[PDB]
Each structure stands twice: as structure tokens, then as C-alpha cells.
Design a protein around this nucleic acid. Structure first.
Length: 43
DNA sequence: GTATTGACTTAAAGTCTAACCTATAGGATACTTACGAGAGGGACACGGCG
């Protein structure tokens, strides 16, 4: 229902392409300090 | 007047040095989604017949 409409809106054209880039970047969330330390040690 | 040579001075330039541009890098608290009509053609929905 509501989640179905969410998934339907997840697949739209978005001809602006800045809105498309924003919906693309919306996929990945933030991180906090300890995982930053872990990533730095790994790299 | 028209043919010369021998000095005699003069304005215009290759090269070394200095400053003034130019390409380039760097700069740690933590901050995470802007602001009219007029006609033709193609695509999506809905209903009809075998």
C-alpha cells in the first residue's frame, strides 16, 4: 500500500537530473568516528 | 655636373641581469537532499469478438 507507493516512486524518470543525482546519493547513509577509524586503518 | 675614397659621427639592435607575473600546493572542532489556437503524431487504457 503505502510501501507499494514508495517503491513505485522509487522508479521515476526525474528529467531534472540534479534530482536524479540527489535520489542516487540518497542510497548511502552517514558514518561515525569508530567506523572512520576502521576504514582509515583498512585503506 | 658626375664619377669616387677615406675618415667621422649616429641611431638601431643580441645578451646578461633583475622583478614581476604564473602554475601549483596547502591551509584540522564539527557541519551530509536548492529554490492564444490549430493540427498531427505517439503512447497508455479500456472494451469487443472468436
Amino acid at each position: 500500500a503505502l510501501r507499494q507507493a514508495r517503491k513505485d516512486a522509487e522508479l521515476t524518470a526525474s528529467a531534472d537530473s540534479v534530482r536524479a543525482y540527489l535520489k542516487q546519493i540518497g542510497k548511502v547513509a552517514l558514518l561515525n568516528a569508530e567506523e572512520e577509524v576502521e576504514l582509515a586503518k583498512r585503506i
